[PDB]
Design a protein around this ligand. Structure first.
Ligand code: GTP
Ligand code: ACP
Ligand code: GDP
Ligand code: A1D6E
Ligand code: CA
Ligand code: MG
Ligand code: MG
Lengths: 54, 332, 427, 437
């Protein structure tokens, strides 16, 4: 059971212990998606204001 | 009124368990995918253990032990016995076993040691005498197989010169008590045993099914415990308890005590019990051997009533109570 | 989050007035508009329903609408009459004659813009308007026909605000006229399209509850409206008082309404109490739970065992163990888990408020979205076609512009709604 | 010295942030006014607590915190609470209308209207940072703000700070404290859209915290104050290495290194012992070995699962209190024999350990007793995928009827983002299952 890289200091100490070894989208792309949804909203709202107008 | 669901319709055993539960008037059965169950009589493969014990205000109990397959899977059972110090290679009740995949690990080095004394070199998967005969049989299936020392000198019942195995039904409860059913079954071969023609594997393979002579000396190729013990007394001057049952109780205890840390539901959010069928092989020296552990075991027709009524008393009503014993507690 | 309240017609204004009486008592406001209460919980969310006047007075955010002056003069006379803002009495004179067409198309049309003006004034005051709640019956003519005209127009001006109604369903056991199934089917068509949440207050239930359970031999509208104030106070507790939930109309709609047309809720109350006579044993939390889920306590005459609960909201009032409330609520589901859809996990939510209602130490209001509400629409649809297959009494409507076709459409949209409720009672 | 900016989002995030920053203040001896008598470097310092506090010319110590809720109720109590003086008003951002438990309302509708305002106030702190490390982001899986605004924020931060690290503290939804029936939709939607923008995520299942509060704190019905104060103890354990002298987990980059080998699998299970009631009059102090053994009881995990049926990829032990290395290795020794600790073949079976001698700090009057030593294990075990499977099942149950879908489509979203976010989770569950058999 091998201890290693033990660092000490006034606050405490740390170390590691082995038991065994081995064996992003663009701002503009965000702006697109985010603005497609707002359009999809405004369509659905206009269809409602069109139905109410009928 | 407790609630339970049923997700393995192929369970001869718990088919009964469901029926008995309803007939108590205090157990209603929900639908498969209804999560507000107290008790899951679950499915055999891919039972969803990750989803259990998350229903607030529901104590949940399932009839299987996650991890239990490490014992009930032939390849894994060998791996378990070789590697656990609790069992060790110096395991005196498991026959020699190697796991060989189809595309010899240290299997060949043992077979050769057998060329040194020309000792018995019969094995199984399926039974051969030449390694090449067998090894060429696992690659014709393509799946992992396991080969074992065949027990060339077994114990034969007379009249018949016949083979047989012993199935003990063990029930482990939510507390990890180990309960052995007092009723056992000898699954007997009606064909007189002989070691010249292995390929005529009807007197070698003792499976109740594979015996599609069925019914000669005892009904259904099954001899219960009262009969066998009688014959033992008369024929060998011994009892079932002493010559055989001790070692079985030793093997059951040892196997289940091994995996207890991996499968115990003591401090877990859901709980498990499970019924196992343990399969043994008695040789001519009255020595018991462990063949296979069966995690999804069927009971013998005559004992269903009693065994399933005991699952409910010991494993189910223990957790969910309502308004001498048929088990032997294996102590630890 | 301000709410704007609207009461329309005979029924709408009589239950409207009780509501303001009942909750004005709970918030410690008196008829003069002055607060005289003990706790501060009473004032924390007082703005949801009341505008704060100078002199630190509290004026309900309520618009009063009728086509006749009758009831509206009544309200101004009643105990809390003076609390209501006088410019918010908006009325005509000709009445509506229990005629959906007169309310929606002829008589109501004249007056509606005047109503929309008061609405707009109140909306402008509002820091963040949640939406509107309306009280009306579906069987008369003002609250029914004009009521749904207002809703159609309000949705045009405020298409993204929440529309909540308390809609009293007609019943032969308590009916003014034979044409109520006509007026209700035309209204339900409107409600299915233009409201987020409607509480189906069935006059059939209020009658049976008054007759059978409260043993009232000859129930008046005042006995029925008692039951309606109690429910209305319950289903708005979580809006008027601080909680762990901080609930509002939109969140309520999100969580109650899996599908948009299935927004008709079964209300329930426990304990059922008759006016005046007070009984003296508080209920055990186990009793509140069994009673509130009892069909005998439902305010929509539907058997909950004939359908499945899509979602449930329950609200407990008084000093009691939330631990026990938890156990009792979990208890009823796991016991009757059959009657709750499996395909909406954890569809029963619960809330608690320390303050009980006047004259009870412990109470439970219940909001169910059960697929059994179809039983209600089926009832009204049967009555409707009993008459329509003979075009009986239709002249009252054709005479005001309406076409047989409009009747066939409404009927058909309703029978559709029943089909939709049946789709999921099986799923 | 490198700075760390904490961003708390929605109700769960903001209330937990109060919890934590109060604790941080007791632990660092900062007062409700932001004064820290111990700081002699007045108006500055590149001390290690300055990773979480800037100092003012007047000697005030100010959280590198920003709070963001789409609705004023919750942050308003921060604005009028014991630690008002602590924060700069610009740090407390408030909407007027909340996401109504709606992932898509908080992401698309109301999100798009506040994302730029928030990022500017975030940039106002990044401009006081000599070498900014990155972000600690606190939020619920369940709320509409919690889930939907957080992922819009996470996306942008990847764009405006592509070189800084992003860590997550995420409240996973539990019906005993839940506030909404659609929380499984919001959970999946936000995990799919945030997965590639978070380097390391610590899930805390409200179910687990609730049961610890009942079993070990003898609290009948835990409140958010009960849950959050216990939750910030764990958070403190996990961050103390950034705020204290040490050699283990000194920067947000070390958390990925030590705990996350494969990028997607970045959900380290947290286990924490001991939780001891402040009411218990006579308590027997637990040993290094008793508490280290407690780290392998599920009943102590932040997520209830079974690490036995799973494989480890990494593992840290964070001790606070009277602990020396020898007692740890002795405890480790005897634990490695009695427990089912299986590592993936391609990872050294081992334990990176860190000890801080200052024992755990408990807020005066809370529910936690003071203790001589405590520990928080961080293990990246595949058993945590159990939590993914549970959520994904509830999601499948509802979505197969498309129940509630319309609330989302009605805000701009497309029925298709539902099957896209869910297919991703299908991937995640599969990555975990390969890695662990
Ligand atoms: N542990 C803990 N969990 C919380 C807390 N507050 C809320 N939650 C959880 O967060 C989930 C809902 O997310 P919220 O943060 O409340 O919603 P939100 O972020 O304010 O977004 P909105 O929908 O706009 O309100 C619920 O399931 C709660 O269990 C808290 O203070 N502590
Ligand atoms: N090492 C050995 N020596 C001799 N005979 C053996 C043996 N191992 C097994 N046998 C016999 O041969 C049979 C081999 O088949 P096997 O044991 O795989 O069937 P099975 O036990 O899996 C059916 P079940 O699952 O229903 O119990 C054993 O049942 C036993 O009868
Ligand atoms: N519960 C209850 N129902 C009422 C009340 N007043 C009227 N109704 C019902 O409402 C229907 C009549 O509609 P009404 O509101 O009076 O006509 P309107 O004035 O034109 O809106 C009848 O079916 C009544 O049963 C009341 O005070 N309480
Ligand atoms: C404003 N009225 C209101 N709203 C509630 N909410 C909003 C917030 C989450 C929520 C989730 C639901 O899942 C089914 C149901 C209901 C609710 C509510 C909840 C109650 F348990 C009791 C009374 C309630 N009353
Ligand atoms: Ca300094
Ligand atoms: Mg009338
Ligand atoms: Mg909020």
């Amino acid at each position: 059971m091998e201890v290693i890289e033990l660092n000490k200091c006034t606050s405490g100490q740390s170390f590691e212990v082995i038991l065994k070894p081995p064996s992003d989208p663009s701002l503009e792309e965000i702006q697109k998606k985010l603005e497609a949804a707002e359009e999809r909203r405004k369509y659905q709202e206009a269809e409602l204001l069109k139905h109410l107008a009928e | 009124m407790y609630t339970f669901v049923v997700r393995d319709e192929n369970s001869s055993v718990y088919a009964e368990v469901s029926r008995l539960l309803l007939a108590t008037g205090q157990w209603k059965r929900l639908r498969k995918d209804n999560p507000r169950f107290n008790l899951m009589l679950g499915e055999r493969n891919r039972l969803p253990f990750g989803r259990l014990g998350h229903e607030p205000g529901l104590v949940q109990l399932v009839n299987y032990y996650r991890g239990a397959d490490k014992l009930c899977r032939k390849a894994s059972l060998v791996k378990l016995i070789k590697t656990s110090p609790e069992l060790s290679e110096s395991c005196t009740w498991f026959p020699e076993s190697y796991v060989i995949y189809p595309t010899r690990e240290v299997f060949l080095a043992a077979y050769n040691r057998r060329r040194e004394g020309r000792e018995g070199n019969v094995w199984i998967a399926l039974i051969s005498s030449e390694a090449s005969e067998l090894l060429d049989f696992i690659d014709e299936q393509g799946q992992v197989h396991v080969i074992q020392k065949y027990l060339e000198k077994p114990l034969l019942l007379e009249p018949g010169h016949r083979k047989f195995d012993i199935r003990s039904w063990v029930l482990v409860d939510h507390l990890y008590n180990i309960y052995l059913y007092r009723e056992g079954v000898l699954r007997t071969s009606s064909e007189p045993y002989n070691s010249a023609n292995f390929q005529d594997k009807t007197c070698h393979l003792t499976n109740h099914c594979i015996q599609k002579n069925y019914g000669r000396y005892e009904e259904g190729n099954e001899m219960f415990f009262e009969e066998f013990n009688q014959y033992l007394m008369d024929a060998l001057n011994t009892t079932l308890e002493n010559s055989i049952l001790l070692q079985i109780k030793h093997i059951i205890r040892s196997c289940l005590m091994c995996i207890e840390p991996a499968i115990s539901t003591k401090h877990l959010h859901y709980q498990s019990f499970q019924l196992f069928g343990f399969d043994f092989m008695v040789d001519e020296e009255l020595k018991v051997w462990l063949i296979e552990v069966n995690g999804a075991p069927a009971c013998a027709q005559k004992l269903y009533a009693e065994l399933c009524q005991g699952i409910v008393d010991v494993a189910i009503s223990s957790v969910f109570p309502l308004a001498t014993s048929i088990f032997i507690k294996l102590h630890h | 989050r301000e709410i704007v309240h609207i009461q329309a017609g005979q029924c709408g204004n009589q239950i409207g007035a009780k509501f303001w009486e009942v909750i004005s008592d709970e918030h410690g406001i008196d008829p003069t508009g002055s607060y005289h209460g003990d706790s501060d919980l009473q004032l924390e969310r007082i703005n949801v329903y009341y505008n704060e006047a100078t002199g630190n007075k509290y004026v309900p955010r309520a618009i009063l609408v009728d086509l006749e002056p009758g009831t509206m003069d009544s309200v101004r006379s009643g105990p809390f009459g003076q609390i209501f803002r006088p410019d918010n009495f908006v009325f005509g004179q000709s009445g509506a004659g229990n005629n959906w067409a007169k309310g929606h198309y002829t008589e109501g049309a004249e007056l509606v813009d005047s109503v929309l003006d008061v609405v707009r004034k109140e909306s402008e005051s509002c820091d963040c308007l949640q939406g509107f709640q309306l009280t009306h019956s579906l069987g008369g003519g003002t609250g029914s026909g004009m009521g749904t005209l207002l809703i159609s127009k309000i949705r045009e001006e405020y298409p993204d605000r929440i529309m909540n109604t308390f809609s009293v369903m007609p019943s032969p056991k308590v009916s003014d006229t034979v044409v109520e199934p006509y007026n209700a089917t035309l209204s339900v068509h409107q409600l299915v399209e233009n409201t987020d949440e409607t509480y189906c207050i069935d006059n059939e239930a209020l009658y049976d509850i008054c007759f059978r359970t409260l043993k009232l031999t000859t129930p008046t509208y005042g006995d029925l409206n008692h039951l309606v104030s109690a429910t209305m106070s319950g289903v708005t507790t979580c809006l008027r008082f601080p909680g762990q939930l901080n609930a509002d109309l939109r969140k309520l709609a999100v969580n109650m309404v899996p599908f948009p047309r299935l927004h008709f809720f079964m209300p329930g109350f426990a304990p059922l109490t008759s006016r005046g006579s007070q009984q003296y044993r508080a209920l055990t939390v186990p009793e509140l739970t069994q009673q509130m889920f009892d069909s005998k306590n439902m305010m929509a005459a539907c058997d909950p065992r004939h359908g499945r609960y899509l979602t449930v909201a329950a609200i407990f009032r008084g000093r009691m163990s939330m631990k026990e409330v938890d156990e009792q609520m979990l208890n009823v589901q796991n016991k009757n888990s059959s009657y709750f859809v499996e395909w909406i996990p954890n569809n029963v939510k619960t809330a608690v408020c320390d303050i009980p209602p006047r004259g009870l130490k412990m109470s439970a209001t219940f909001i169910g979205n059960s697929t059994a509400i179809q039983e209600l629409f089926k009832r009204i649809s049967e009555q409707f076609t009993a008459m329509f297959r003979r075009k009986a009494f239709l002249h009252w409507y054709t005479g005001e512009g309406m076409d047989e076709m409009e009747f066939t459409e409404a009927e058909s949209n309703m029978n559709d709604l029943v089909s939709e409720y049946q789709q999921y009672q099986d799923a | 010295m490198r700075e760390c900016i904490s961003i708390h989002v929605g109700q769960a995030g903001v209330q937990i942030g109060n919890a934590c920053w109060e604790l941080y203040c007791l632990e660092h001896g900062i007062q409700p006014d932001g004064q820290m008598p111990s700081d002699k470097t007045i108006g500055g310092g590149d001390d290690s607590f300055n990773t979480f506090f800037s100092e003012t010319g007047a000697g005030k110590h100010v959280p590198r915190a920003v709070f963001v809720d789409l609705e004023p109720t919750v942050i308003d109590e921060v604005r009028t609470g014991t630690y008002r003086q602590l924060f700069h008003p610009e740090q407390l951002i408030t909407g007027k209308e909340d996401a109504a438990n709606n992932y898509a309302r908080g992401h698309y509708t109301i999100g798009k209207e506040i994302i730029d305002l928030v990022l500017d106030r975030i940039r106002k702190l990044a401009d006081q940072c000599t070498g900014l490390q990155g972000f600690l982001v606190f939020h619920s899986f369940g709320g509409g703000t919690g889930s939907g605004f957080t992922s819009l924020l996470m996306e942008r931060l990847s764009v405006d700070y592509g070189k800084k690290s992003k860590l997550e503290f995420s409240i996973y939804p539990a019906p005993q404290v839940s506030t909404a029936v659609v929380e499984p939709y919001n959970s999946i939607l936000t995990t799919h859209t945030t997965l590639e923008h978070s380097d390391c995520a610590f899930m805390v299942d409200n179910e687990a915290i609730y049961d610890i509060c009942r079993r070990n704190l003898d609290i009948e019905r835990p409140t958010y104050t009960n849950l959050n104060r216990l939750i910030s103890q764990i958070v403190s354990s996990i961050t103390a290495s950034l705020r204290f002298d040490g050699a283990l987990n000194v920067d947000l980059t070390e958390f990925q290194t030590n705990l996350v080998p494969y990028p997607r699998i970045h959900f380290p299970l947290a286990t924490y012992a001991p939780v001891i009631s402040a009411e218990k009059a006579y308590h027997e102090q637990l040993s290094v070995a008793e508490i280290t053994n407690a780290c392998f009881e599920p009943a102590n995990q932040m997520v209830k699962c079974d690490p036995r049926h799973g494989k480890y990829m990494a593992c840290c032990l964070l001790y606070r209190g009277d602990v020396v290395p020898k007692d740890v290795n002795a405890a480790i020794a005897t634990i490695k024999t009695k427990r089912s600790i299986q590592f993936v073949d391609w990872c050294p079976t081992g334990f990176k350990v860190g000890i801080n001698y200052q024992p755990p700090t408990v807020v005066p009057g809370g529910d936690l007793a003071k203790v001589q030593r405590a520990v928080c294990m961080l293990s990246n075990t595949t058993a945590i995928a159990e939590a993914w499977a549970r959520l994904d099942h509830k999601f499948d149950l509802m979505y197969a009827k498309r129940a509630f879908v319309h609330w989302y489509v009605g805000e701009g979203m497309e029925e298709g983002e539902f099957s896209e976010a869910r297919e991703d989770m299908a991937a995640l569950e599969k990555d975990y299952e390969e890695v662990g058999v």
